[PDB]
């Protein structure tokens, strides 16, 4: 169906321990395909998905030049933000940037993204119009003014509507056997007595791609949102993801509970019960 490409930049200062580290990673949907790390013995852009390996040496050198120049500029930016906030030269700080493009099931540009954070708090964002900025505070307004003066948004728009979309479509074709394949969850329900009159029902979803999934428990057809323990979706390490949802139920009432699974890889939404 729908698809996205995202780059994630993390720049981390560390006073007394060298220059700020810059890390860039690229994803198509829930698949990482590239990395760069300024701390590596020989910093270079590296493949992280098999379908990107076919790209020529000019691709890899272009990426490396981009990430190397960004490394330098992010170090300047970290110094700038430390100043904007009147911060001591003694603390470690982090700039993060996420950007990229979304496609619909056509797939044409649905929307572009470009957002930054400082120390884990939203700092500045490109608006959906790809023309204007939202600044979080007076410090970010300084960043806004110099991006407005340098016509940054104009460059962002040209990239997000052009090359971002073009290369995403290219990756989606080159990696179609995985990127355009949804693996449904493998599901089952476990039962764990906790006491004489309560037991845990745990609904498992395993081996699914992409990570987007809904697991819900119902009692008599009514969702148990407040009583459902829901873990964060977690990677298996083989491209696939895992999740569970659990409810503590009165013993003997197990059959009044149904687990419901929604995933794009499923022919139909699933309804599961405990099978003694």
């Amino acid at each position: 169906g729908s698809h996205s490409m995202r780059y994630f930049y993390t720049a981390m200062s560390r006073p007394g321990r060298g220059e700020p580290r810059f890390i860039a990673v690229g994803y198509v949907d829930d698949t990482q395909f590239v990395r760069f790390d300024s701390d590596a013995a020989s910093p270079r852009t590296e493949p992280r998905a098999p379908w990107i390996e076919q790209e020529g040496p000019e691709y890899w050198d272009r990426n490396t030049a981009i990430f190397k120049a960004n490394t330098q500029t992010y170090r300047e930016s970290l110094r700038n933000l430390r100043g904007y906030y009147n911060q001591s030269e003694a603390g470690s700080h982090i700039i993060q940037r996420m950007y990229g493009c979304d496609l619909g099931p056509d797939g044409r540009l649905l929307r572009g993204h470009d957002q930054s954070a400082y120390d884990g708090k939203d700092y500045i964002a490109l608006n959906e119009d790809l023309s204007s900025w939202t600044a979080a505070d007076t410090a970010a307004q300084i960043t806004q003014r110099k991006w407005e003066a340098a016509r940054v948004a104009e460059a962002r728009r040209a990239y997000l509507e052009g090359l971002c979309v073009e290369w995403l479509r290219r990756y989606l074709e080159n990696g179609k056997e995985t990127l355009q394949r949804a693996d449904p969850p493998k599901t089952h329900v476990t039962h764990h007595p906790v006491s004489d009159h309560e037991a845990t029902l745990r609904c498992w979803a395993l081996g699914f791609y992409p990570a987007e999934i809904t697991l819900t428990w119902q009692r008599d057809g009514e969702d148990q949102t407040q009583d459902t323990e829901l873990v964060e979706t977690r990677p298996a390490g083989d491209r696939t993801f895992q999740k569970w949802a659990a409810v503590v139920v009165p013993s003997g009432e197990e059959q009044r509970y149904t687990c419901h699974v929604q995933h794009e890889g499923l022919p139909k939404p699933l309804t599961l019960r405990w099978e003694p």
Binding site: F8, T10, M12, I23, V25, Y27, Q32, R35, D37, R48, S92, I94, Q96, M98, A117, D119, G120, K121, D122, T190, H192, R202, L206, V231, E232, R234, P235, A236, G237, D238, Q242
Partner: protein, 99 residues
């Protein structure tokens, strides 16, 4: 200002005694990015543990997967040891094959 990591310890495949598998420690929801993660076998740190490249979620918090090959038995105890600036003491999370 700072966020404490969520920690899950689990296996890639359904755990079967005497069968080679992958032991995972997924840390997520944390900020800042500096984190220490060890995998333990019977209380002792496992050598050659690998991790995924630093990335982050929509709320800006970081996530990482630490992983190594392992062969589960009935008697071998596995755990994750996590340290972070938010934690005053390292947090040990035991592997439960039903989790």
């Amino acid at each position: 200002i700072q966020r404490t990591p969520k920690i899950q310890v689990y296996s890639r495949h359904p755990a079967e005694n005497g069968k080679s598998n992958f032991l995972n420690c997924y840390v997520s929801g944390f900020h800042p990015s500096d984190i220490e993660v060890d995998l333990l076998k019977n209380g002792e740190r496992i050598e050659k543990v690998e991790h995924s490249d630093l990335s982050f979620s929509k709320d800006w918090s970081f996530y990482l997967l630490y992983y190594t090959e392992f062969t589960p038995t009935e008697k071998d105890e596995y755990a994750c040891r996590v340290n972070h600036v938010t934690l005053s003491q390292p947090k040990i999370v035991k592997w439960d094959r039903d989790m």
